[PDB]
A paper describes a structure:
2′,3′-cyclic nucleotide 3′-phosphodiesterase (CNPase) comprises 4% of total myelin protein in the central nervous system (CNS), being the most abundant CNS non-compact myelin protein4. CNPase consists of an N-terminal polynucleotide kinase-like domain10, a catalytic phosphodiesterase domain11, and a membrane-anchored C-terminal tail, which contains a cysteine residue that undergoes isoprenylation. The catalytic domain enables the rapid hydrolysis of nucleoside 2′,3′-cyclic phosphates to nucleoside 2′-phosphates. The CNPase catalytic site, lying in a groove between two lobes, has pseudo two-fold symmetry and contains two apposing His-X-Thr-X (X denotes a hydrophobic residue) motifs, characteristic for 2H phosphoesterases 113537.
Tyr168 is one of the aromatic residues on the CNPcat surface that we suggested to form a binding surface for RNA34. Tyr168 interacts with the substrate ribose moiety through C-H…π hydrogen bonding. While the Y168A mutation decreases catalytic activity, Y168S retains it, albeit with an elevated KM compared to the wild-type enzyme. In the absence of the aromatic ring, the serine OH group appears to be enough to retain catalytic activity; this could be related to differences in water networks or overall dynamics in Y168A and Y168S. These structural features suggest that Tyr168 also has a role in fine-tuning the active site conformation with its bulkiness.
Numbering used by the authors: 162 to 335, 340 to 378
Write the structure that this text describes.
């Protein structure tokens, strides 16, 4: 009867969102201007572009419109599998509207998405769904490993891809760094995949709640 949200998740405060967003843009700018990235364009890009500078801020030309957020369960108002089952959980109802701190441990880039890796607490892990299509468990990774904040997408890429891209990146790391940015060391995982491991983890303030289209 009562339909569900479009999605549950942690929605960053405008201030925490602005901070993480600005940091993301700096990372794209710095990465795109880095020697290691420039010498590896052929694996990142597909065909016909000459070899001058690619501006990643232009490349990831689809950014989240509202405040940045870390999605837990996409529900589509109940049209998604497991939506009703996730929403009715006691812990989700308990946590609804409450404040959390999300720890960001890294920022990554692939030819499809740019994002930030979220490291969920044991408390927050209770709010992670257990029936996602391709869960960490069917892949030999800790549950909630795909938790993330999308910063940008390529033109024909849907934002769901960001989580998939992270899972793949976290399989590779299961190699010496090729560079050093002001906030951390840069890794090149091949196939246009790049990861910046922050020397000090970013902490953003967010509210666990439900979003409606
Ligand atoms: Cl923002
Ligand atoms: Cl609270």
């Amino acid at each position: 009867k009562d339909f569900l949200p479009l999605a549950f998740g942690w929605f960053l405060t405008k201030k925490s969102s602005e901070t993480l967003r600005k940091a993301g843009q700096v990372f794209l700018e710095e990465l795109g201007n880095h020697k290691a990235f420039k010498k590896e364009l052929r694996h990142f890009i597909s065909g016909d572009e000459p070899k001058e500078k690619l501006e990643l801020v232009s490349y990831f030309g689809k950014r989240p419109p509202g405040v940045l957020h870390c999605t837990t369960k996409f529900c589509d108002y109940g049209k998604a599998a497991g939506a009703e089952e996730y929403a009715q959980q006691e812990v989700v109802k308990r946590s609804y509207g409450k404040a959390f701190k999300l720890s960001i441990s890294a920022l990554f880039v692939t030819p499809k998405t740019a994002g930030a890796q979220v490291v969920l607490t044991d408390q927050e892990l209770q709010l992670w769904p257990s029936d996602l299509d391709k869960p960490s468990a069917s892949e030999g990774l800790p549950p909630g490993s795909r938790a993330h904040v999308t910063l940008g997408c390529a033109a024909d890429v849907q934002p769901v891809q960001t989580g998939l891209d992270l899972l793949d990146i976290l399989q590779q790391v299961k190699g010496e760094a090729v560079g050093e940015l002001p906030r951390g060391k840069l890794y090149s995982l091949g196939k246009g995949r790049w990861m910046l491991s922050l020397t000090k983890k970013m902490e953003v303030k967010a509210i666990f709640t439900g979003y409606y289209g």
